Amino acid sequence: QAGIIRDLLIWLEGHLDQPLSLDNVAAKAGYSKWHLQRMFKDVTGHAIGAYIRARRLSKSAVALRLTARPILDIALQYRFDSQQTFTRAFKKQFAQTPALYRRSPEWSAFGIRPPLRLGEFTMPEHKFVTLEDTPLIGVTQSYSCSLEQISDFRHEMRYQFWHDFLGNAPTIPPVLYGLNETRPSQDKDDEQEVFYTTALAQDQADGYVLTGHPVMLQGGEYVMFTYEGLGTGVQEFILTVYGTCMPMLNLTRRKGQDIERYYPAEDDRPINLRCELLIPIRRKLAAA
Amino acid sequence: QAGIIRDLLIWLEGHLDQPLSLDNVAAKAGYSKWHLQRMFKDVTGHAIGAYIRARRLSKSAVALRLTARPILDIALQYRFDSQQTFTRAFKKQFAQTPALYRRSPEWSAFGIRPPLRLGEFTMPEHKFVTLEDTPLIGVTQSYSCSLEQISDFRHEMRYQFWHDFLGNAPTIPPVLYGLNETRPSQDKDDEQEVFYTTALAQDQADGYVLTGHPVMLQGGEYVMFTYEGLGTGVQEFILTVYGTCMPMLNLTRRKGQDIERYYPAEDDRPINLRCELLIPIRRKLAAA
DNA sequence: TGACAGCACTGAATGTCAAAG
DNA sequence: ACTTTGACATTCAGTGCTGTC
């Protein structure tokens, strides 16, 4: 039945990561290696083996754009044999090498295999907006972490800036910005840097940001996803935005910065918070 | 009822040959696949799919030893897709490759799966005998046919010899000999020639004028099976001797020649003939 | 008839020894 | 020496048919 694959998928997704698993290991679901395959193929219309391989290579496309980790660390984490096995496989799915997949100014979901929803999926709310150059003031640091740690690392960088700011400020700014940017390495182009900028509107922060500098929030077209929930749901919010909404919208991310907007001045059970993820986009022209 | 499978087994055994059949074609005897099986199973105590499979490789084995046809033929005639199909399976049941199986000097019923006997199977009469070398004058030729055609081909060979021989003979020989012998090829040892020798022994009637050369009837130990009945049953006889008697007695055939003995001097409804088949054997020594 | 274990043939991927370039 | 290339053994995914309960 579908209630079996329903729970199986919740497991896989959360374990493509560390734990190893092939049709045999996946049998640790209670059934025989074969009945399972036919069952999985009935309920989802997909062959279990080729899906797992595609979810892993999908996480891999995201980890290559969002993190600074070296191509090997990323492949090893997702149970791949070696860089070579990884590469070959990767080329088949995205018709390109991981190195060129990362260096690429633009990004599309051409070969992304989003996770599978077996029934009720509520896609984060989204809207298309145009932003105008917004003068900001902030601190920007290069960071390195796994796809699974992004939310935590960013929360730490934001925490420092914010509490340091409120220590010397008579007024509370309405918004806290978190700008993510990627920079291709000029040596071997398999490497790239990732920076996070915690900033405030120039009007707001005024001369209260210790070690702050001028930052120009770039204007242009963006898609804006909104999130409202426990701060602990933020990690899941970002990955589904990159792992399932961008692809589903068949959109192209332009070179630029990702913009997270927080409204801290609005958050003793875990606190509920709201924030918006803004992705720099290039919409396609529909053909008559 | 046990009578239902009784009739099918007979049909099976006489069609493992050309006609194809599986749990679907086999269900073309009335009941549906699922039910038929449980019947054929709760009775015989064997899976009709595995059975039909085992009977074929069994006949594959016999043909590989008694005929000169190329492996691919044997494999096909018994409804097998390719030679590899046949080969894998053959190894499954016999633990040897067909090629080596044929080449082998000695032979045993290791993997031969004899046809099940529901009703009352009257196994042929046997006796272990020891023969002395004997000179015979005869004729021999390399023949080549299928398992189901042996008795006929041989019969025609004795006929020429016999009637050609009688034309000049003042007295009738009391015994006509038929010696089957195999000879490994020298190129691809997946092939082999088969020779039949029709010959006569010195009797108490002075002379004879026969074409041919001196042939040695090799001495040694043999198992003798005797048959009485229509010359049309001779084919059945040979097969049940090779396909079920050799196996049950768990006997081993030594390199050498098979020996048929006919008493045609005593044979207008289909007349009843009498003959003995002698196979070269080497009995096992038991263990204290 | 149905839920489910296990085998058989195909095929893509990877690994191996080696004549070939 | 050193990577390229093809016959061939081994592996495991994938879809189907056999087979027990």
UniProtKB/Swiss-Prot annotation, chains A, B:
Give the Gene Ontology MF terms in alphabetical order.
bacterial-type RNA polymerase holo enzyme binding; DNA-binding transcription factor activity; sequence-specific DNA binding
Q: Which UniProt keywords apply?
A: DNA-binding, Transcription, Transcription regulation
Q: Which domain of life is it from?
A: Bacteria
Q: Which residues form the HTH araC/xylS-type domain?
A: 6-104
Gene Ontology annotations of biological process type: regulation of DNA-templated transcription
A GO cellular component annotated for this chain's UniProt record is: cytosol
Residue ranges crossing the lipid bilayer per the database entry: none
Q: Which residues bind DNA?
A: 23-44, 71-94
Identify the SUPFAM superfamilies for this entry: Homeodomain-like, Probable bacterial effector-binding domain
What the protein does comes down to: Transcriptional regulator. Binds to the right arm of the replication origin oriC of the chromosome. Rob binding may influence the formation of the nucleoprotein structure, required for oriC function in the initiation of replication.
In terms of NCBIfam families, this protein maps to:
PRK15121.1, RobA_TF
Write down what this protein is called: Right origin-binding protein
| Species of the source | Escherichia coli (strain K12)
